Amino acid sequence: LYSRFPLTWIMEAADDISYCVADLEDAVEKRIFTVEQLYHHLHEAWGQHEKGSLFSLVVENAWEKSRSNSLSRSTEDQFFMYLRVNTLNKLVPYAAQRFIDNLPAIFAGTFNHALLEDASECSDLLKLYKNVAVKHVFSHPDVERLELQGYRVISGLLEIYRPLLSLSLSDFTELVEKERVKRFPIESRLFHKLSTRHRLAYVEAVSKLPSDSPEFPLWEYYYRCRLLQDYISGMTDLYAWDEYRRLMAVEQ
Amino acid sequence: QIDFRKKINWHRRYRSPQGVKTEHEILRIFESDRGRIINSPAIRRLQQKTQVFPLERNAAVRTRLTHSMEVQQVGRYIAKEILSRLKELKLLEAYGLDELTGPFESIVEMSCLMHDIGNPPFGHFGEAAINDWFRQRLHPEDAESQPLTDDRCSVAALRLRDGEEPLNELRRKIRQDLCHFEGNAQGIRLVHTLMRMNLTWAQVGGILKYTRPAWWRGETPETHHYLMKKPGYYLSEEAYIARLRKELNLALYSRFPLTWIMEAADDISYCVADLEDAVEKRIFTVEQLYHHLHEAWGQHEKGSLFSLVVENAWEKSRSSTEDQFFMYLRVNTLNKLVPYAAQRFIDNLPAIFAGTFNHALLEDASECSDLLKLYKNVAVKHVFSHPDVERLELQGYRVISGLLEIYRPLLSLSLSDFTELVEKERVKRFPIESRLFHKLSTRHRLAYVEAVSKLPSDSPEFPLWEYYYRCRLLQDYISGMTDLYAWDEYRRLMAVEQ
Ligand SMILES: [Mn+2]
Ligand SMILES: [Mn+2]
16 A cells, blocks of 8 residues: 555656756747856856866756857757756666665655655756746746636636536436436536546446445535546647637637 | 925935026926936837727827827917916016026926826726725725724725724725725826836926825815815825925925916817817718807807807818818917916916915816817717727726736735735745736836835734735736736736637
């Protein structure tokens, strides 16, 4: 109970590594700051500077390679290529070794740590990238507005489907059997917009319940909500934005 | 005694000049003011706020900016006329104006360019939306007297608490002030606190159009009913307006004398241009307008103002035509009304200099006021009632209403919470309020911090002051937008683009 599958630690470490560097590269593409400004933001946030540290071996290395290269490569292409490679060459072997060194608990699935342990210098290099990304990229207004817009879109969608929840058991169930329910025109059509795969999982789950039990209405409601959360969470950003505008009548 | 050297104050509130100064040096100070205002974003924003008609794709129609440039020309004329009438009576040197002729004109010219500078996006209707939104939240009428058992105020700290307090008095004012947003009151706030423009006292005195505080609740004094018609400054500027009154030798509730000139320029230039645009938008023809004007003046007494001004221009307009009718309608109106206004100014100069004259230059008794009253009546029945105009006014009211609801989270927050949002940039548990807070303009946020920090930390009225300053912050942000930016931000945050 509560044990993890051993390969999960590896995927978790791959997430931890790839979590940030790419977002800085994209930030330079979006002209938010120059590659030169990025190097100094990274130099500043590392603080305790030494000839020999990860910073020196990984990110300072990439900065020097980017200056005076053949292979007619862009400065930014060259900086980030070697920022990616240098980071991998240091952080992958460390993660692999950690996996092997703790293989008994990882195999049992009870190892209460990540591969890039929250202490290590490798985790410090990753924290370095996060610190810059947090203060200079994720704070960009265009990003922050998108976050504001998304929250209103998913919030608003749930209210549009609120009718399906503000219904009794016998009522919602009648809507599941009869396709056309005479007296519930809105809830009917709302029900049919839900993707077929999600309605099927609701019917399947509820049918496996004992019909007569006193907890049946509790289980039905749980599955009804799961039905809606399935429908919403299965959308793309653009589909969900589109449906929001459409069901508030604003597109043609 | 009348001495404009005591009224045309070239000192500043901050990093100020002092000490004698020649005629040339005083001129250069006031010309600095011109450069400060002309280069202000707040003036530039005037070309995308609307004057009556929706912004057309061919700029044929007036905006707040082009209208204000016309008002400036009218004010220039009235000032030039007062000074010339005065030079001929030899009162110029006696009134201390011989070395201030330039500034006297400039201040009026700039005061004209700057009315409507503090006006919110959709004009009369942006003000309406703001005050209505805060009325439902604060309910200032529930604070008029003894604390009320059901205080409908939404804010814990602003509700009248029964335990006989003097704190209830500050609550009373804060609640009233915040529900009387006024463009003129906002203009002073903008030129002083928000845009940090550091104008001369005289220049700021010129746009203090009314002398009533926004927090005023009772009946207005019979002696100052005109000077206190609408609110003139906020609670937030009381200390500044006190510094200003002393510097301009104003009694309490007294107005700066050059303000009357700018006001008359507004009263004159307020309407004729809107009739000209109505003809451009083909609402009615120039011929129809003449007869709508003939009919609404009533009793024709051939020798009347109508015949001298509008009938005259109608006759001239025969032998381009609409250009000709409106050119001579404007000129004829100016040539009768500017001398009337300039004369009224001189004849009532003691009270106007004292700043207490409880009438306009174009008081309702005048035939001249009847000519202006004529233009408004036709404009109301045929222009301002037009569906396209009224619809824009409906839309604008909804847009500003909607914007305020979007920032409600910033207001439905405790003091300890909101402060944490100001100190730390990243607040973990308030991601929406954080992100909403960052959308507020840096200049407005700075004016909130500055004001809050100057308060005594320990006071029991501190949370009341903070909420007031937070509310001003939101109104500063909203009233600063152009019509179009506010319309865009509404759509963006309601999500209709990406
Ligand atoms: Mn990931
Ligand atoms: Mn005006």
